[PDB]
């Protein structure tokens, strides 16, 4: 009674290779597949499936292809350590100390022939090693340095996943699902929504909201050693900026070989900071208390304070933002007791140009000057937090993975291997 | 009517007696600028290499050309207990897939043998 | 020739297809793009190997369907279409009715093989 | 091409019984389905049901629920509406919709309308 | 059910000048199988309605460039590239669902 039947619609979980997709440098160029101007939505009538958004490989596939695309955008670029060099270095010109300026004797076009050039610098990125006093660039002694290529643009273009042929996207509808378990409602796509590659640490600057409620996943909960991923169900607006009109010059190091290099500030010398709305803040941290209470307990006072210590990646909320990467002091935003029963709020930012994009050892950028002053806006759209581990529960903001910034998308998306052939008993022989 | 297409994966969580009448519309989605492309070349092969397996499969069982072929190899019962009135009525295909996916390499060497023997005999009459 | 028949009439033609039909599939950098060109043969070979196969023409140059013409496509006669044009011009002629042809015969062959099942469960 | 062919218009009395029919011709395909519609002068359409020939199986529109009825037919190539009786209020233009369907395709290729037959109710 | 309302329902136009006719949704016009089904048709004074346009923007067979369509969701339209003395009558807006089916008010194009 054996019949076979191919085009069944069965799968099997599976891990695959997603390819990227665009519509209509880095990113911006990234064509990738072209999307579809009208992506079809199919609706799974009857069936329900179970996610994981902890062990979801798609998140490493972003991790994957988001480190190698930066590191092959540098590939052209020119390198630093012909920087590495002592210099000689005083204060700027102010009165009353972030930035320093600092000298020293570089080479030119011609190998018999030196200049002496000189360029503002961030403190974060110099040290000294006499210990004008005497200053090397702070990650000469452990890694190369690249200049980014000016040219070369890092802004956050959403881009789309799609699986290859045999393989589908099932996508959850449930507007309450927590990241594992079933999700009752659902269709398959072959493409995702686009998701912009934003890289952040304490606060989620520019995702999805929830569809209803503040939504609060993690791993365990009770296992205070994973974070705690919030997804605010409204947007918080911060404004964020380098307020100094800042100037720019080139140097010619060698034969097309250029550095960029601060010139000087037109005007004032004023911290980079952002603006955070007080009274949305106070609202979505009185969402977040009332959802969190739901694993804690309805009458259990929770606790907002500041970040434990460690690097500015680690203690402070990071962001790339003009080309500029502001480290900011988020300790105003978290100050606050919850107990059962306009204005807004400024955070001190640093800036920094030699950065370590993947807190990796032994390769970091160099961020080539922004003219001009800066300003960003952004939609805050979540957080990432700690438990501080009776009657209180503290909480405090932390960095993290690049990884759980994308999961924080990709939670509602699995990939499955479609598995056409197959049999059944019938009536029939042949 | 409902305008009912369903659509690629369609009603999968409809019974296997409703669910195979859309067997086409799977079969006919599964073929579907300078470097690192090997990602993508080296998904195209697989994919085509998934698909040549299927199509060899279809071919030894001499199923080869349909979207459904009725053999005659028996069922051998201890495989599913099942009734027929609820198998094809009460189940979807995901469910009997692993209902009874312990016994896909009994029932495909089956397969395989029974289109042997039918070869043959067809030489041996054509011989005559 | 490869494309001997090209210039050809239809009813001249049909005749030559497995001679087109046998030539279609036939260490550094750039090793790649080699590849890309056998990859993107396949696929090509297999859609159309899939075709037929879902409209029950699979192992076939010519097969003849159960689906009837509907005219509006083409009303020209018959004799004028295989005798007095080439394939190139008759491929242009119904260019734009391609999908409603093989939609009509994959839904025929549908049947056709639900029937063989009832059949052969009688 | 697709055509649908109309029965002739028709008035009745009110509480007199009416049938009204189209036919399809110039084209051969398999799944199709019925529709009917109303024009009531002045307006727009209202729907009024529908049906697949293949397995006489009808929904209707909520409106004329229970007031009309429609066939099968598909064994003639025709469609018919049936009134059980008629009211002052139905008196209005009659359509029937014919749309060819593909059932491995989910895509309407054809859609035709018949030029419309009034139904009238008078005294 | 689907709730389908048109704006303008009164449009005299320049001739020879583009046109354009909201249709707005009760709910979405999206089906369980992915696909949006809305279409488009043409009464003319004296005529059945022809469609014009299939899902949403398909221009149908032998319907001219003049007529296109697009939209999403609840939010659709029809676009006349320019509008001739021939294409005056009401243009509707059909609705394609999960049943009951229905029809837009539909918007009467005139000459002016």
């Known amino acids: 009674w054996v019949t076979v039947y191919y085009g069944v619609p069965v799968w099997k979980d599976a891990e695959t290779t997603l390819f990227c997709a665009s519509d209509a440098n880095v990113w911006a160029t990234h064509c990738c597949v072209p999307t579809d101007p009208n992506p079809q939505e199919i609706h799974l009538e009857n069936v329900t499936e179970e996610f994981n958004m902890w062990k979801n490989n798609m998140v490493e596939q972003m991790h994957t292809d988001i480190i190698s695309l930066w590191d092959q955008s540098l590939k052209p670029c020119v390198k630093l350590t012909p920087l590495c060099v002592t210099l000689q270095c005083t204060n700027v010109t102010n009165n009353i100390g972030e930035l320093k300026n600092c000298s020293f004797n570089m080479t030119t076009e011609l190998r018999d022939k030196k200049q002496k050039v000189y360029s503002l610098f961030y403190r974060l990125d110099v040290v000294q090693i006499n210990e004008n006093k005497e200053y090397r660039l702070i990650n000469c002694n452990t890694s190369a340095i690249t200049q980014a290529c000016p040219k070369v643009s890092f802004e956050p273009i959403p881009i789309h996943y799609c699986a290859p042929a045999g393989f589908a996207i099932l996508k959850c509808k449930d507007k309450k699902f927590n990241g594992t378990g079933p999700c009752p409602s659902v269709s398959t796509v072959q493409c995702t929504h686009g998701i912009k590659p934003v890289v952040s640490t304490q606060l989620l600057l520019n995702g999805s909201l929830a569809e209803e409620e503040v939504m609060i996943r993690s791993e365990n909960i009770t296992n205070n050693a994973k974070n705690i991923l919030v997804q605010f169900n409204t947007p918080v607006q911060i404004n964020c900026t380098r307020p100094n009109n800042n100037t720019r010059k080139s140097i010619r190091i060698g034969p097309g070989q250029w550095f960029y290099a601060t010139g000087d500030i037109i005007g004032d010398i004023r911290q980079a900071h952002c603006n955070v709305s007080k009274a949305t803040w106070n609202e979505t941290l009185g969402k977040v208390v009332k959802q969190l209470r739901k694993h804690f307990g309805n009458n259990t006072i929770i606790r907002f304070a500041n970040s434990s210590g460690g690097d500015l990646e680690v203690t402070t909320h990071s962001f790339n933002c003009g080309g500029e990467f502001f480290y900011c002091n988020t300790s105003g935003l978290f100050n606050s007791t919850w107990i059962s029963n306009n204005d807004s709020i400024t955070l001190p930012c640093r800036i920094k140009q030699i950065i370590n994009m993947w807190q990796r050892i032994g390769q970091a950028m160099y961020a080539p000057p922004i003219q001009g002053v800066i300003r960003c806006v952004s939609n805050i759209t979540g957080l990432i937090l700690t438990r501080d581990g009776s009657t209180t529960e503290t909480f405090r903001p932390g960095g993290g993975d690049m990884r759980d910034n994308w999961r924080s998308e990709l939670y509602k998306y699995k990939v499955v291997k479609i598995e056409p052939l197959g049999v059944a008993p019938t009536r029939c022989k042949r | 009517i409902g305008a009912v297409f369903l659509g690629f994966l369609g009603a999968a969580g409809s019974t296997m007696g409703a669910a195979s009448m859309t067997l086409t519309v799977q079969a006919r989605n599964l073929l579907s600028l300078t470097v690192w492309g090997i990602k993508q070349l080296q998904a195209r092969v697989l994919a085509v290499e998934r698909y040549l397996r299927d199509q060899q499969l279809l071919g030894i069982w001499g199923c080869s050309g349909k979207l459904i072929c009725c053999t005659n190899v028996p069922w051998n019962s201890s495989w599913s207990n099942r009734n027929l009135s609820e198998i094809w009525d009460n189940m979807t295909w995901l469910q009997w897939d692993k209902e009874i996916s312990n016994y896909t390499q009994i029932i495909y060497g089956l397969l395989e043998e029974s289109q042997n023997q039918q070869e043959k005999n067809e030489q041996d009459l054509l011989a005559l | 020739g490869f494309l001997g028949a090209a210039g050809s009439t239809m009813g001249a033609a049909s005749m030559t297809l497995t001679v087109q039909a046998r030539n279609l599939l036939s260490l550094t950098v750039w090793g790649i793009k080699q590849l890309q060109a056998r990859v993107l043969a396949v696929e090509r070979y297999l859609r159309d190997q899939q075709l037929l196969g879902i409209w029950g023409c699979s192992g076939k140059l010519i097969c003849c369907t159960n689906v009837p013409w509907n005219s509006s496509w083409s009303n020209r006669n018959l004799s004028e279409i295989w005798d007095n044009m080439t394939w190139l011009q008759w491929d242009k002629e119904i260019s734009n009715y391609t999908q409603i042809i093989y939609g009509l015969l994959e839904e025929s062959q549908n049947q056709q093989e639900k029937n063989e099942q009832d059949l052969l469960a009688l | 091409e697709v055509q649908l062919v109309q029965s002739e218009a028709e008035v009745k009395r009110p509480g007199e019984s009416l049938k009204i029919s189209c036919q399809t011709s110039?084209?051969?395909?398999?799944?199709?389905?019925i529709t009917w519609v109303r024009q009531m002068p002045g307006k727009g359409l209202e729907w009024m049901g529908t049906?697949?020939?293949?397995?006489?199986?009808?929904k209707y529109s909520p409106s004329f629920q229970g007031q009309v009825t429609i066939s099968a037919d598909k064994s003639i190539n025709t469609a018919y509406l049936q009134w059980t009786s008629l009211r002052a209020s139905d008196s209005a233009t009659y359509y029937c919709?014919?749309?060819?369907?593909?059932?491995?395709?989910?895509?309407?290729?054809?859609?035709?309308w018949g030029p419309g037959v009034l139904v009238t109710v008078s005294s | 059910d689907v709730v389908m309302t048109q704006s303008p329902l009164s449009l005299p136009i320049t001739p020879g000048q583009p046109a354009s006719i909201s249709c707005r949704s009760s709910?979405?016009?999206?089906?369980?199988?992915?696909?949006?089904?809305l279409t488009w048709y043409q009464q003319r004074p004296g005529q059945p309605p022809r469609r014009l346009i299939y899902?949403?923007?398909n221009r149908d067979s032998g319907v001219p460039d003049r007529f296109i369509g697009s939209g999403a969701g609840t939010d659709f339209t029809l676009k006349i590239s320019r509008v001739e003395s021939e294409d005056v009558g009401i243009y509707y807006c059909?609705?394609?669902?999960?049943?009951?089916?229905?029809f837009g008010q539909g918007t009467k194009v005139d000459i002016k």
């Open positions: 110039g084209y051969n395909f398999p799944n199709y389905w």
């Open positions: 919709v014919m749309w060819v369907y593909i059932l491995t395709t989910g895509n309407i290729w054809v859609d035709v």
């Open positions: 059909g609705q394609i669902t999960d049943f009951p089916y229905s």
């Open positions: 049906i697949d020939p293949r397995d006489s199986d009808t």
């Open positions: 709910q979405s016009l999206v089906h369980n199988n992915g696909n949006t089904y």
């Open positions: 899902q949403v923007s």
